[PDB]
Amino acid sequence: LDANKLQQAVDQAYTQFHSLNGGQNADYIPFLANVPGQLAAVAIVTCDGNVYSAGDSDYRFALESISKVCTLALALEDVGPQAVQDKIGADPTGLPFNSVIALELHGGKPLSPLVNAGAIATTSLINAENVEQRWQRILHIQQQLAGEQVALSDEVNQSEQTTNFHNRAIAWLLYSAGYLYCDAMEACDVYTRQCSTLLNTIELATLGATLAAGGVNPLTHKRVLQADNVPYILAEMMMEGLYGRSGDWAYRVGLPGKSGVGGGILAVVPGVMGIAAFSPPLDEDGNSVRGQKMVASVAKQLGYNVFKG
Amino acid sequence: LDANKLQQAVDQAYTQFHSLNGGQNADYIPFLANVPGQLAAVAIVTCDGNVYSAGDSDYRFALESISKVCTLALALEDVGPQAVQDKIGADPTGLPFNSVIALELHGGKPLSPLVNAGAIATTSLINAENVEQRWQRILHIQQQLAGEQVALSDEVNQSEQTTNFHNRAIAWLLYSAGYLYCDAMEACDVYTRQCSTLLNTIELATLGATLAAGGVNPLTHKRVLQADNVPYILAEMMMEGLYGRSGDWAYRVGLPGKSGVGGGILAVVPGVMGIAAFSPPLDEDGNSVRGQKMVASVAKQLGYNVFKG
Numbered sequence: 001l002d003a004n005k006l007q008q009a010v011d012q013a014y015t016q017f018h019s020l021n022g023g024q025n026a027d028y029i030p031f032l033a034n035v036p037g038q039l040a041a042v043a044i045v046t047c048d049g050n051v052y053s054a055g056d057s058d059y060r061f062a063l064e065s066i067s068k069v070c071t072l073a074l075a076l077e078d079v080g081p082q083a084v085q086d087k088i089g090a091d092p093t094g095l096p097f098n099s100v101i102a103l104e105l106h107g108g109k110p111l112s113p114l115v116n117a118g119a120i121a122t123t124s125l126i127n128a129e130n131v132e133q134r135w136q137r138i139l140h141i142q143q144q145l146a147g148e149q150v151a152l153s154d155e156v157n158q159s160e161q162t163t164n165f166h167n168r169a170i171a172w173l174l175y176s177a178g179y180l181y182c183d184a185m186e187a188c189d190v191y192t193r194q195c196s197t198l199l200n201t202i203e204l205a206t207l208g209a210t211l212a213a214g215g216v217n218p219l220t221h222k223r224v225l226q227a228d229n230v231p232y233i234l235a236e237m238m239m240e241g242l243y244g245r246s247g248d249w250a251y252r253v254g255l256p257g258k259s260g261v262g263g264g265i266l267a268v269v270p271g272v273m274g275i276a277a278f279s280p281p282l283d284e285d286g287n288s289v290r291g292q293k294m295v296a297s298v299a300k301q302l303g304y305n306v307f308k309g
Numbered sequence: 310l311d312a313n314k315l316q317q318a319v320d321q322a323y324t325q326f327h328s329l330n331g332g333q334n335a336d337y338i339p340f341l342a343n344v345p346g347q348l349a350a351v352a353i354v355t356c357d358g359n360v361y362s363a364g365d366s367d368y369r370f371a372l373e374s375i376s377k378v379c380t381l382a383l384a385l386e387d388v389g390p391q392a393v394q395d396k397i398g399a400d401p402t403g404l405p406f407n408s409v410i411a412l413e414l415h416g417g418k419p420l421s422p423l424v425n426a427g428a429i430a431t432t433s434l435i436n437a438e439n440v441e442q443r444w445q446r447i448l449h450i451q452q453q454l455a456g457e458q459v460a461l462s463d464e465v466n467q468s469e470q471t472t473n474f475h476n477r478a479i480a481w482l483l484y485s486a487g488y489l490y491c492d493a494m495e496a497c498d499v500y501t502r503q504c505s506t507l508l509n510t511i512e513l514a515t516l517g518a519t520l521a522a523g524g525v526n527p528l529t530h531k532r533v534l535q536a537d538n539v540p541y542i543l544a545e546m547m548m549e550g551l552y553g554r555s556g557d558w559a560y561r562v563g564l565p566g567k568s569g570v571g572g573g574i575l576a577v578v579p580g581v582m583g584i585a586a587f588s589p590p591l592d593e594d595g596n597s598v599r600g601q602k603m604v605a606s607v608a609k610q611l612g613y614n615v616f617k618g
Contacts, residue, residue, distance in 0.1 A: 047618075081560070091556030092548070094403020094411065094420075102403065111403075112556070212618060234616035235559040238547060239401070247400030247421070250544040251390070256616065271618020306615040307540035307547070307565065309356075309523060309580015 001272075005302070006052045010042050013277075013297035014054035023281035023289035026064075026261040029159035035061065035263070035280045041201035042277040042294040045209035049218035053202055060149075060198040061278055062156050062262035065097070067142065067194040068119040069207065069258050069266070071126065072236060074141045075113070076229040078127045084232070087181065088113045088121050092239045092246065097286065098166055100173065108177020114240040114258070117170045117179075123194065124180045124187035131186045138194050144217060144224040146207040150199045157196035164192050201264070201278045208266050208274020234268055241266075242292075245285045253296045254305030265291035269304045310581070314611065315353055315361045322586070322606035323351050323363035332590035332598040335373075335570040338468035344370065344572070344589045350510035351586040351603040354518035358527035360511055369458075369507040370587055371465050371571035374406070374595075376451065376503040377428040378516065378567050378575075380435065381545060383450045384422070385538040387436045393541070396490065397422045397430050401548045401555065406595060407475055409482060417486025423549040423567070426479045426488075432503065433489050433496035440495045447503050453526065453533040454519045456512040466505035473501055510573075510587045517575045517583020543577055547615075551601075554594045562605050563614030574600035578613045 018040040027033035041055035075084055084090075089111040093102040098116050103109070110118035128134035142150045171188040174180035180187055199207075210217045211233060215225030225233075237256035242249045249257055255275075257267040263280040265288050275298050279290035299305065327349040336342035350364035384393055393399075398420040402411040407425045412418070419427035437443035451459045480497040483489040489496055508516075519526045520542060524534030534542075546565035551558045558566055564576040564584070572589040574597050584607050588599035608614065 085557065085560060089556070090560035091553060092401045092403055094401055095414075105403075214618065231563050231614050231616035232560055235556070235563055238616070239556045239559055244400060247398070247544070247548045248394070250548060251394060251399035251541055254540055254544055269618075270616055305540055307543035307579055309521065309578075 001046055003050065006044055009298045009301045010044055010052050010054045012301060013042050013294040014040070016297060017290050017293040018055055020290050020293060023283050025280045026282055029156070029163060031156050031159055032062065032261065037280050040279040040290050042298060043201045043205040044273050044275050044298065045202065045205040045218065046273045047209060047213040047218050047271065051202060057201040060200045061264060062153065062195070062260070063142070063197045063199055063264070064195045064260035064262045065119070066204070066258050066260035066264050066266060067197070068114045068122070069233060069237065070142045070145055071119065071122050071138055071194055072113045073145065073225055073229070073233055074138060075122045075125045076232055077225060079125060081229065081232045084113065087125055087179070088118050090236060090239070097243050098170070100170065103173055108173065108179050110174065110179055112236065112240040114236055116167060117174060120167065120171050120187050120191045121174050121179050121181070123191045124182040131190060134186065134190050135193050138190065139197070141224070142197055144222070145210045146199050147203040150197050150203060152193060153196050153198050157193055160192045160196050161189070164188065167191065201276050204264050204266055204276035204278070205274040208268045208276055211268045212270060212273050234270065237268070242287055243285050245287060253299055254307045255299055257295070259287040261286055263288040263291055265295045267295050267299060269299070270306065272304065275299060310355060312359065318607045318610040319351055319353055319361045319363045321610060322603040323349070325606060326599050326602040327364055329599050329602060332592050334589045335591060338465070338472060340462070340465050340468055341371065341570065346589050349588040349599050351607065352510045352514040353582050353584055353607065354511065354514040354527065355582045356518060356522040356527050356580065362511055366510040369509045370573065371462065372506045372508055372573070373504045373569035373571040374428070375513065375567050375569035375573050375575060376506065377423050377431070378542065378546065379451045379454055380428065380431050380447055380503055381422040382454065382534055382538070382542055383447060384431050384434045385541055386534060388434060390538065390541045393422065396434055396488070397427050399545060399548070404553070406552050407479070409479065412482055417482065417488050419483065419488055421545060421549040423545055425476060426483060429476065429480050429496050429500045430483050430488050430490070432500045433491045440499060443495065443499050444502050447499065448506070450533065451506060453531070455508055455516040459506050459508045459512060461502060462505055462507050466502055469501045469505050470498070473497065476500065510585050513573050513575055513587065514583045514585035517577045517585060520577045521579060521581055521583050523580070543579060546577070551596055552594050554596060562608050563616045564608055568596040570595050572597045572600055574604045576604050576608060579615065581613065584608060
C-alpha cells in the first residue's frame with residue numbers, strides 16, 4: 001500500500017469533516033456529556049502494521065457498545081460459531097439497540113450479539129468459573145485486539161453501573177426465556193464493565209486491523225483469533241453494527257462496521273486495513289456524525305467496498 | 310479461474326444435496342404446488358461467460374420474488390441510488406416478507422426494496438407513461454440480465470392476480486402513507502406480473518453473473534447496468550435477500566443472495582461469478598432447502614465469502 005495515499009486519505013477526511021456540525025453527545029451519564037464536543041480523529045491501521053492518523057487520535061474515549069465485537073470474538077473462540085448462532089443468533093432485529101419488542105417477537109431470542117440483549121447473552125456465554133474471571137478474560141481480549149493500554153474507567157463504570165436499569169431488565173428477560181448462560185446480575189455487571197474501558201482512535205483502528213488481518217494483531221505480531229472465526233464477526237457487524245442504520249451503511253460504504261456512544265466508528269477492509277474515527281456528537285441512531293463521514297470518506301477515497309469486485 | 314475446480318464444486322454440491330429431504334413446495338397456487346418436488350439443479354456462470362452446471366439446469370421455474378432484484382436494478386438506473394434510499398430504503402425489517410407490522414412501526418416506509426412492501430413501491434418508482442410500458446420495461450431488464458427466453462407464464466400470472474389480496478392491502482397501505490409512486494392497483498398488477506416469469510437455473514446464475522461483472526451480461530457481452538449501481542443492489546441483497554434468514558446466510562455463506570418461492574437461490578461473488586441453485590421444496594422462511602445447501606456448498610468449496618481477506 002502507498003503510504004502517501006493513505007496519509008492523504010486520513011488528512012483529507014479530517015479536513016473535510018472534522019468540524020462538521022450536527023448531533024449531540026450521549027448525556028445519560030456526566031462523563032459522556034462532558035467530553036469536549038469538538039474532538040475529532042480518524043486513523044488507518046494496515047494489516048502490515050503501518051499507522052496513519054489525523055486529529056485527536058490519542059484521545060481515549062469510552063468503548064461502550066463497540067465492546068460487543070470483542071466479546072463476540074471471545075465467545076467464538078470459546079464455544080465456536082454453531083453455538084453462537086444457536087444461543088445468540090446471526091440476524092438483524094429491525095429495531096433499536098435496547099428494544100424489548102424485538103425480544104418478545106422472537107420468543108426471547110436476542111437474534112444478534114450486537115444489540116444490547118444479544119451482547120448481554122454473549123457476555124454470559126464466555127467460559128468463566130466466576131464473575132471476576134469472566135471480566136478478566138474480556139478485558140484481556142480487548143487489550144489483545146486493540147492495545148495493551150485499554151483499561152476500565154472507574155468513573156465511567158461507576159456511572160454506568162448505577163444507571164443501567166433497563167439492561168438489568170433485559171438480563172432478566174433473557175434469563176427467564178432461556179437465553180442467558182450465567183447469573184443475570186453477573187452478566188449485566190460484566191457487560192457494563194466491558195462498555196466502560198477507554199481507547200483512542202488508533203487503538204480502535206487496531207481492533208479493525210486485527211480483524212482485517214484474519215485475527216493477527218499487526219502491531220503486536222500476535223495471533224489473537226482463529227482466521228476462520230473472523231468472517232462470522234464481520235457478518236454480524238454488517239447486519240447490525242450501526243443498529244437501525246446498518247443497511248444504510250452497507251448501501252453507502254459497503255464495509256462491516258460498528259459504532260459506540262463514545263463516538264467511535266470502526267470499519268474493516270477484509271485483508272487490508274482497519275479504519276476508525278471518533279467524534280462525540282451522535283445522530284439520532286447513536287452513531288457519531290463526523291465519525292461516520294470520516295470513515296466513509298477514507299473508504300471512498302481508497303476505493304474499498306466489499307460489494308465492488 | 311480453474312475450470313476443473315468450478316465443475317468439481319458444482320458436481321459435488323449436486324451429488325451431496327440434490328436429494329436432501331425437508332420442506333414443502335409453495336402451494337398457494339396450483340402451478341407451484343404441482344412442480345415436481347424432486348427437480349434440482351445448480352450452476353455457476355462466471356464473469357468471463359463460462360457455464361458449469363449439474364442436475365435439471367434447463368427446467369424453467371417461476372422467478373417469483375427474485376424479480377425484486379431486477380426491478381431494483383431498473384429503479385437505480387431510472388432514478389439513482391439517493392432516490393431509492395429515500396423513497397424505498399436500504400434497511401432490513403427484522404420481520405417476515407409480507408409483514409405489515411414492519412410498515413406501521415416505521416410510519417409506512419417499506420425499508421427494503423426486497424420485502425414485498427418495498428418491492429411493490431420499487432415497481433411503482435420505475436419510469437413509465439402507463440401500466441403496459443411499466444411492465445414492458447421490467448420484462449426487458451429481466452431478459453437483459455438473465456436471458457432472452459425469460460418470459461411471463463400466463464398460468465402463473467392468472468393464478469397470482471386472482472389470489473394476491475394481501476399484496477393489494479400492502480399497496481393501499483403504501484399509497485396511503487405516501488410510499489407509492491403510481492396508482493395502487495397498477496403497482497400491484499405489475500409486481501404480480503414480474504413475479505410470474507419463468508427461468509432456468511443457468512439463467513438465474515446469469516443474473517448473478519451480470520451483477521458479478523459489474524453490470525455486464527457475460528453471455529451476451531452487453532452492459533445492462535452502470536457499474537456504480539451494482540454495489541447498492543448487492544448491499545440490499547445482503548441485508549434482506551433471504552428475508553429473516555439473511556443474517557444467517559451472511560454468517561454461514563457471506564455472499565449477497567436472494568431466494569424466491571419458485572425454489573431459486575442466487576448468490577453473487579463480486580467480480581467473479583454468479584452461483585445459483587433450484588429445488589421446489591421450501592423451508593419455513595420460504596427458502597429452498599436443497600437450493601440453499603447447493604449454493605452454500607459451491608461457495609464454501611471455492612472459498613468465496615466477502616468477509617474473508
